[PDB]
Design a binder for this molecule. Structure first.
Ligand SMILES: *[C@@H]1O[C@H](CO)[C@@H](O[C@@H]2O[C@H](CO)[C@@H](O)[C@H](O)[C@H]2NC(C)=O)[C@H](O)[C@H]1NC(C)=O
Ligand SMILES: *[C@@H]1O[C@H](CO)[C@@H](O[C@@H]2O[C@H](CO)[C@@H](O)[C@H](O)[C@H]2NC(C)=O)[C@H](O)[C@H]1NC(C)=O
Ligand SMILES: *[C@@H]1O[C@H](CO)[C@@H](O)[C@H](O)[C@H]1NC(C)=O
Ligand SMILES: *[C@@H]1O[C@H](CO)[C@@H](O)[C@H](O)[C@H]1NC(C)=O
Ligand SMILES: [Ca+2]
Ligand SMILES: [Ca+2]
Ligand SMILES: [Ca+2]
Ligand SMILES: [Ca+2]
Ligand SMILES: [Cu+2]
Ligand SMILES: [Cu+2]
Lengths: 699, 704
């Protein structure tokens, strides 16, 4: 019942025509736009309000209007703004409202605007045509200069030092064919100022070569020709790992393949997955990325919403690009930068794969093929098991099979894997792996307070990753409270021999009444059992709870003292529980990246000393680690050990383990024929006949 | 050097050591399965691991292998001062000698009460409970419990309150057919004193019924018939979950099954597993449990030994049984209590399964069928992957497949799953799940400071699970140090706009020089990068490291203040790194369970202020969680979320990710046909390369 389905291609074209016809002429296609134009940057699903949605899904009411949200760069005017416009209803839009002010209390400063694909292209024209030839002598002598065809540019982080700046540090790298350029930094770094609406007016504020700072490329080339700059010649091709992805070893016998002996045990219709146990809807926001809604275990709802909010990456280093860099990846877009899943590599070969349609930086809706995969996975583990050789002879267990939804977001070098996994015990696991290439610096000098040499001439820069999740649990209805259970030892005299002492173990329950009590900072410890719960109880009279259980190796957060830190105040928390308000739909924003100093959304604002005793609650989970890159990250960072996320786990929510009622259960007694088919289902063509491999392709 | 030094004893070898001991132990030597306290007894015979010097000498430098010997534990009960003794017996397979290492190892005789409780001993206790004692309470027992064939006993933990005690609290439970009796405690608990060598002399120290203490079952029945006890009728049958394991739902369509399209890609020969990438030996200690030795990635050794050392379970509760209970399961035995893996449940259906032979509390070697399973598992995840739409058009990834060894130890109610999993990146994951049934109390009174109601009349008692692992890494040779890498922010002026401040991120490396510095307590925080390393370095000049990365939600440890805490000192640590000594083989002992007050091994002794700069090092990793039982543990505790253990991860050990050279890797350009077979191995699985096997007909390893 498809309220939460990302927009169809029809629905996008429809909103795009509507916007065209009503936004004034002189409306330029975003992929070609200059700063001083008008521009549709984004069109995408605007999620409905929760009231109306549940009204419809639970109480049969009519659905809420299906609307879209378009971001429009209004560059052609005295005071340029960015504007968010709601456009509905679908599929025949008749209205368009400008929610900008009602939402962020004022206009959106034009510098918060994400850097357009055209803008990057215009910056590379200035760099390679006007600027770089001024240093053609150095670049011949260090990096095989040709007129800028062999070199290539990569963005950084927040752009400038202060609200309203738009000055970006750019590294230069060899333009490696068929493998990651990110490892071949050439040592040159340019602070480009591109705030102006007129690209002609763009300057080059600073330069960095090989340990030293200059004021222009002309000054650097003065100092080189004056023989005053020791230049080293950096190789340009090479072999293995640092240069390739292609294995030299020929393919061996084949890895284990999984198939479904008697057909799949789940279906995907549109945005809705359904199985014997689990029902839910799914999607990608363009900037927020993955999300699932209306998660229903055996037909009862557990969560209204679980959704990625933000990923973050804080670097340090020798060079100015590295030490400035704090990527707030929502400002690029986790959904925009989704990539095709490659069958049999990113997901089981036999998974069902679904496309994703989007309208971003174009006026055509485009489509990313195989963006999502959904599949059942046999884990190899038992979910549960007991073998009794004692007093009575029996065995009873159950191999865990798991249901899984996966997207992958390729933000330049990094490939983020997002997983939503659905256990047959009633638990939901959320997971986040980082693979892909490292972002690297040129090796020079004081290295080692800042990272590891990881190839010739390559410094693997130290950095943290963090990601933020919204968990809108509705545990047995809307009104939830949060409990914190834990443990304690209490010295006591042994009752039946009181001259003797015994350390008496005891549970510890405190009911958290206030937002501030449930806001938990990185660094401080936290209750071992922490769960959202209901007024209602299970058979045995305990409050029905879903428990959050995290998996994080937190990096130390950017210190509060920094002006920047407000653009990601969620980084400072492990976990926070909050009154769930419509005015507070998201934890970061697409506009924080390019101005964290005046944050377009500041998460610490949500924690504001209200009650959380019997309210519609939402948990916010931070997860992440520290990364000191090392030789085994070349060519890619591996998944092993880097899984982070959390478990949502039943806690007296049921009256017993629901897997007890599993169809795939197994039991037998000592006195039975354990290998007779009427006692044991395991005791019973040309099996998997496979789809011919396909690929979603490239840009 | 081609020998299998690390192989659990075969059955011929066990019979041989048994025969030898028989002939040479004096006559009047009784079979342990039928032995009384005052008898002589062979409790255990099992492989004695060789000394490291000699073993490597052989394995690396070609020298001859060290004498393969066995270690027998012998209960010497027939004498003025009864001892336990450990005897080495070799060489095999034709033993010619036997020495009594008891004194040489633990500085003195082994006090007889440290001995584990024999199967006969438990039976003699049950004879005293059901024949002599329990009928004195026959009135009560009719009224409440449908009265001694319908009831059944279960042990506890340390036995007493003081070194030398041997008095055990025993719960009484309905003798439920075909499902866990552990959930049906009837409310009666008997403190039995069985220290004496004459079972006739055994007493019943105290009694506990439904909230109240009494001095004997006779005085309980006085007060019952005097109408002075409010007695609670506890049902005897029931349905679903609290009573069954058998699902009422009929089998549906089949779950995913995994097979190897063109043969297996590993082999098990005896104790030795071998694959394209990983080569290692494996076994069970009878009491220690799981262990692997001589682990070699692509031919180079990473670890000499990884071995379970102890599991622990500290309980609390309303009732005396629960609040006393601290299991040190080594004292029962993780190997002894291994159980058959049930194919297609405990491991993949097509995994290769291996038996385990043992001689314990008998004179015949017996065999546990399907005790281990080894298998490759496709994980679904990529190990690694990158899709470039930027500047150049390519794709390069690799689905992670993994190699796995698994044993399962069923210690009465609990089924521990031990996993050792071998990633193709060079990492080694160690894992530990607990499923099975909960140990439960009768629900009564101020419950809730002590756990959760989990069925009618059943309290799920709170507890902690902790396990201890020995990790003897030999990173690029024997001489290792430990480094602690971490991070810091340093306020600074932005160099190009000094007016402006920037929070400067930096790496932090300190080299830990002393044992105490690398001993990290539960509760303390602890370096984010902690690794053992070499004098030697990789191509780029950083020291060659394997890094320990833990996965623990540790309970608070038993407070030091308790006399008992010495028996498991390792609980108090997350991690410790130690000079690896032969005198210090193991972290716990089979003899701690029944006397933690005077501990037969005390782990804190190992941490004693020596250097760990450039020595043969051994890390000790504790892992564990808190468990407040809850409805969803009925009938069994589930695995999901309760995986605990650690990763051993390369850290500038190689010059690059070795999976770069994988056979299973995948790459193609934008300008290529991604679905052509000469470009992409995956575009042939259909065409021809499928065909699921005919499966082996299901078998089962059976029961006692
Ligand atoms: C941002 O700019 C847009 C136009 O570029 C503003 O919207 C227009 O406002 C005028 C009156 O201010 C109307 O007559 C038009 O019909 C409006 N067009 C639309 C689509 O809104 C908008 O007011 C500006 N926002 C702010 C807060 O400055
Ligand atoms: C533990 O018990 C054994 C016998 O039960 C003792 O061993 C015997 O000791 C006598 C005299 O020392 C010898 O002549 C026997 O032949 C020994 N038997 C064996 C096989 O060792 C043992 O010495 C006792 N240990 C201690 C320290 O009490
Ligand atoms: C970079 O290299 C690729 C192929 O190796 C080429 O197709 C592309 O046009 C080059 N130029 C730039 C700067 O993108
Ligand atoms: C316990 O139950 C089993 C039935 O499975 C039976 O064989 C046995 O006799 C019963 N009695 C005792 C005390 O074990
Ligand atoms: Ca709030
Ligand atoms: Ca809620
Ligand atoms: Ca020592
Ligand atoms: Ca070592
Ligand atoms: Cu990283
Ligand atoms: Cu438990």
């Amino acid at each position: 019942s498809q309220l939460f389905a990302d927009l169809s291609r029809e629905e996008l074209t429809a909103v795009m025509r509507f916007l065209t016809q009503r936004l004034g002429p002189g409306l330029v296609d975003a992929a070609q736009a200059r700063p001083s134009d008008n521009c549709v940057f984004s069109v995408e699903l605007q999620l409905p309000p929760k009231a109306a949605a549940l009204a419809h899904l639970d109480r049969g009411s009519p659905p809420p209007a299906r609307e879209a949200l378009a971001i429009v760069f209004f560059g052609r005017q005295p005071q340029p703004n960015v504007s968010e416009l709601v456009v509905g209803p679908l599929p025949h839009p008749s209205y368009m409202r400008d929610v900008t002010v009602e939402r962020h209390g004022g206009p959106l400063p034009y510098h918060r605007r994400p850097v357009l694909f055209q803008e990057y292209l215009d910056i590379d024209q200035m760099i390679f045509n006007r600027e770089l030839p001024q240093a053609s002598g150095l670049l011949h002598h260090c990096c095989f200069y040709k007129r800028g065809r062999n070199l290539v540019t990569m963005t950084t982080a927040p752009r400038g030092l202060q609200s309203g700046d738009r000055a970006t540090w750019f590294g230069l790298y060899y333009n490696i064919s068929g493998a990651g350029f990110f490892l071949h930094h050439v040592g040159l770094e340019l602070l480009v100022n591109h705030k102006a609406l007129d690209p002609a007016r763009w300057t080059i504020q600073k330069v960095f070569y090989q340990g030293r700072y200059y004021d222009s490329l002309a000054q650097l080339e003065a100092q080189f020709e004056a023989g005053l700059v020791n230049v080293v010649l950096i190789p340009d091709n090479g072999t293995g790992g640092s240069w390739s992805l292609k294995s030299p070893v020929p393919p061996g016998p084949a890895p284990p393949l999984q198939f479904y002996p008697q057909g799949p045990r789940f279906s995907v219709q549109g945005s809705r997955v359904a199985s014997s146990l689990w029902t839910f809807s799914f999607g990608l926001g363009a900037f927020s990325g993955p999300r699932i809604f209306d998660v229903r275990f055996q037909g009862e709802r557990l969560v209204y919403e679980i959704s990625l909010q933000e990923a973050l990456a804080i670097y340090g280093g020798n060079s100015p690009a590295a030490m400035t860099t704090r990527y707030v990846d929502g400002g690029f877009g986790m959904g925009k930068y989704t990539t095709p899943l490659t069958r049999g590599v990113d997901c089981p070969y036999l998974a069902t794969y679904v496309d994703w349609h989007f309208l971003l930086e174009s006026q055509a809706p485009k489509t990313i093929r195989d963006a999502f995969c959904v599949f059942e996975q046999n884990q190899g583990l038992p979910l549960r098991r007991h073998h009794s050789d004692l007093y009575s002879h029996y065995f009873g267990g159950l191999a865990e099979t798991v249901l899984v939804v996966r997207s992958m977001s390729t933000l330049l070098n990094y490939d983020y894997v997002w997983d939503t996994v659905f256990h047959p015990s009633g638990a939901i696991e959320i997971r986040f792996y980082a693979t892909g290439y490292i972002s690297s610096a040129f090796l020079f000098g004081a290295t080692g307070k800042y990272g590891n040499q990881v190839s010739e001439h390559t410094l693997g820069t130290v950095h943290t990753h963090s990601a933020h999740f919204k968990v809108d649990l509705d545990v047995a209805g809307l009104e939830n409270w949060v409990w914190a259970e834990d443990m304690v030892f209490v010295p006591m005299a042994v009752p039946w021999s009181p001259e003797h002492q015994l350390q008496r173990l005891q549970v510890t329950r405190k009911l958290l009444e206030m937002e501030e009590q449930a806001a938990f900072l990185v660094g401080s410890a936290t209750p071992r059992y922490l769960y959202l719960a209901s007024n209602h109880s299970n058979k045995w009279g305990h409050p029905r709870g879903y428990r959050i259980q995290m998996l994080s190796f937190a990096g130390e957060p950017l210190p509060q003292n920094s002006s920047m830190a407000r653009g990601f105040s969620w980084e400072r928390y492990q976990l926070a529980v909050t009154q769930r308000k419509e005015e507070e739909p998201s934890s970061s924003s697409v506009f924080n990246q390019n101005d964290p100093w005046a944050p377009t959304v500041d998460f610490s604002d949500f924690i504001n000393n209200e009650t959380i005793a019997g309210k519609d609650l939402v948990a916010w989970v931070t997860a992440g680690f520290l990364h000191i890159p090392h030789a085994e990250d070349i060519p890619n960072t591996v998944t092993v050990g880097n899984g982070v996320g959390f478990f949502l786990r039943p806690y007296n929510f049921f009256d017993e383990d629901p897997s007890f009622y599993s169809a795939d259960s197994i039991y037998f007694r000592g006195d039975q024929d354990a290998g007779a088919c009427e006692v044991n289902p395991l005791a019973c063509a040309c099996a998997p006949d496979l789809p011919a491999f396909s690929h979603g392709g490239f840009s």
